């Protein structure tokens, strides 16, 4: 009795949020889902890093259906640091657009540690993990929480397979302070009309972050959940200064590669 509509085909994603871990990848994808021309995968696929042997038909079948003109997207934050991922994504399509939501490497590292802490309460201290010798002097650049934050090093690998014009570096800090402004730039990059705007957001004082007045799936207000916007433990103040000192030259190189000063160093 009801009219059942064509929902279109499943397309491979024309744009992927490839990083960074704890940069604000869920927030960005959630906000983009408000747009009538966006369809997104929910959970992180981890195709190009973990499930690549399943093949592209399996990956395609994970995708939402789309009507003509809609963009298909997913986010997997580990892609950015996955050595094989640039070649593999280019093999799917050299024209894929890539979004990297970046964040102050120091708060990104603490966020990453705090995520582990929320699931494993008796992990070692952040300060012990920061140093080779677990006390001072030399920073353990091999520790994942520090290594992920050296964005210029990972970016080099991507630029061997993509032109930088196909990459957008989104400010995780501005995504919080001015979500509508940042989403304006994202919509431009994706070729989307600039529909997501200031009126889609409000500041939730209890959450401490922007929330959506309406989500794609909700007539009611939507904040991200308990795993988003965690209270960080306090980190030793001198350790923080040392980590900021370690990242500064790498940050400046990243500003030079991307053409933008993200403000993490004054
Ligand atoms: C409203 C509306 O509209 N609605 C609508 C819609 O809905 C939708 C929506 O929209 C959306 O939004 C949603 O989404 C969602 C999703 O889905 C979900 N998912 S799930 O899956 O979960 O489900 C979610 O998501 C989220 C979550 O939450 C999270 O979680 S947590 O918890 O974690 O937080 C996630 O996360 C993730 C991340 O991200 C990742 N990253 S990357 O980068 O990787 O990518 C990951 O991470 C992880 C990893 O994995 C790992 O690795 S491995 O390999 O290992 O595995 C890593 O690990 C590491 C760590 O971290 C470290 N640590 S530190 O500290 O350094 O950092 C290390 O660890 C270590 C330590 O250290 C030491 O200590 C230890 O030692 C030991 C141990 C043991 C022993 N014994 O045993 O004896 C001894 C000693 O060790 C350790 C180890 O090793 O382990 O290291 C490690 C490793 O490293 S390397 O590098 O070397 O490798 O990391 C990790 C972490 O975490 O960190 O993954 C993760 C996860 O994991 S698990 O496991 O947990 O699983 O994710 C997130 C995201 O975002 O994604 O949620 C969401 C949402 O949210 S909100 O907010 O937004 O709310 O969805 C939805 C749905 O879909 O439903 O729609 C719908 C539908 O519709 S349609 O139409 O479409 O159909 C509707 O209905 C509605 O209404
Ligand atoms: N509106 C929002 N609500 C909640 N978290 C937001 C947000 N906009 C940005 N974020 C950031 O998104 C981070 C998580 O990034 P990802 O989804 O890539 O793992 C959070 O880390 P914190 O928990 O350290 O605050 C938080 O700072
Ligand atoms: Na973590």
Residue numbers in the entry: 141 to 406
From the study:
Heparan sulfate 3-O-sulfotransferase (3-OST), the enzyme responsible for completing this modification, is present in seven different isoforms in humans. The enzymes transfer a sulfo group to the 3-OH position of glucosamine in HS. Here, we report two ternary crystal structures of heparan sulfate 3-OST isoform 3 (3-OST-3) with PAP (3′-phosphoadenosine 5′-phosphate) and two octasaccharide substrates: non 6-O-sulfated octasaccharide (8-mer 1) and 6-O-sulfated octasaccharide (8-mer 3).
We also obtained the crystal structure of 3-OST-3 bound to PAP and 8-mer 3 at 1.55 Å (ESI†). Despite the presence of 6-O-sulfo groups, this substrate superimposes well with the 8-mer 1 substrate, positioning the acceptor in the same position with respect to PAP. Notably, the presence of the 6-O-sulfo groups generate additional potential hydrogen interactions between 3-OST-3 and saccharides a, c, and e (ESI†). These additional interactions may account for the apparent increase in binding affinity of 8-mer 3 versus 8-mer 1. Surprisingly, the 8-mer 3 binds to the other molecule in the asymmetric unit in a completely different orientation (ESI†). The 8-mer 3 is offset such that the uronic acids, GlcA (saccharide h) and IdoA2S (saccharide f), now lie in the GlcNS6S saccharide c and e sites, and the acceptor GlcNS6S (saccharide e) is positioned with its 3-OH distal from the active site. However, it is located 7.4 Å away from the phosphorus atom of the 5′ phosphate and not in-line. A kink in 8-mer 3 is visible due to IdoA2S (saccharide f) being in the 1C4 conformation, as opposed to the 2SO observed in the productive orientation (ESI†).
